């Protein structure tokens, strides 16, 4: 069958200048499947990376709408999640800068 595992949720991390403005401040950004929740993502990140996180902030980014001769094109909707680790301050080396 299928069992319940917390790390069936994370899609990817996102790299941006704002993402680095947060990485300097012990706050991280992750790409998360839409049907998730902050509690699930919190438990997932804690279990996978052995770091005790404080709170998680999530946002929905509506897809853009790109021109093409074939017709009206729309990309997929994505959900980004903002996570902030505690004062313990354990960097995630798997982020790869």
């Amino acid at each position: 069958a299928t069992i319940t595992d917390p790390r069936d949720i994370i899609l990817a991390p996102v790299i941006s200048e704002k993402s680095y403005g947060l990485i300097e401040d012990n706050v991280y950004t992750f790409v998360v499947h839409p049907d998730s929740n902050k509690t699930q993502i919190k438990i997932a990140i804690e279990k996978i990376f052995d770091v005790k996180v404080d709170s998680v902030n999530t946002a929905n980014r509506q897809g853009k709408r790109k021109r093409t001769r074939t017709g009206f094109g729309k990309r997929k909707s994505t959900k980004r999640a903002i996570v902030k680790l505690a004062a313990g301050s354990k960097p995630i080396d798997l982020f790869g800068a």
Partner: protein, 64 residues
Amino acid sequence: GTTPGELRELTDDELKDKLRESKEELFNLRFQMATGQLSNNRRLRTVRQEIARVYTVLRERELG
């Protein structure tokens, strides 16, 4: 991944064991390719193969 000749002659505890390990491998491989460190597809496909057939054999021997 493994031959049906072995799979059908092996027992309940062992397909439970490969069930848990295959869920664990689905977990790992799907999310290294999610992180972007992984490249190819056939791994998710063959672990899908394993989970599908083990669940099929589970209900088969449960009914029979």
